Request: fold
Amino acid sequence: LSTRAGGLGINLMTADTVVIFDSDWNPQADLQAMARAHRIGQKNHVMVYR
DNA sequence: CCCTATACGCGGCCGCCCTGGAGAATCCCGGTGCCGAGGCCGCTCAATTGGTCGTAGACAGCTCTAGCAACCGCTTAAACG
Reply:
C-alpha cells in the first residue's frame, strides 16, 4: 500500500500483519494505515512491525 | 729545202678556301652611400609610495514567506492514434 491513498473505504478483512516500512509525519495517517486490518470483525491478533 | 698554217703545253693573273691574333662584352670583387631599424637622451606628467581617515560591506541575529520533493485525489479538456 501507499499510505495516504484510498481513504477509509478499503477492506482488508483477510489481513493479519501490518508492516510500516516508512513512518509518517502525521501519526493519524499511520493509525489509519494499520487500521485497515484492525476493524470490527477481525478473527486474528493484528500485529504491527515498524 | 724553206715558208706557213696548226694544234698543244703552260708563265702570269685573278678568284676562292682554311686559320690566326687583336679587341669587345660579361661576371665577380672591393669600396662606398642610402633606407629601415635599433639604441640613447631629454622633457615631463601621471603612476607609485606613504600616511590618514571615513565607511561599505561582511557578519551575526531574529522574523515571515516562497519554494521543493514526493505523494494524494478529482475533473476535464487537450493530446494522440
About this structure: Residues 34 and 42 of chain A are 13 Å apart (CA to CA). The first strand of chain A starts at residue 17 and ends at 19. The longest helix of chain A spans residues 27-34. The beta strands of chain A are 17-19, 47-49.
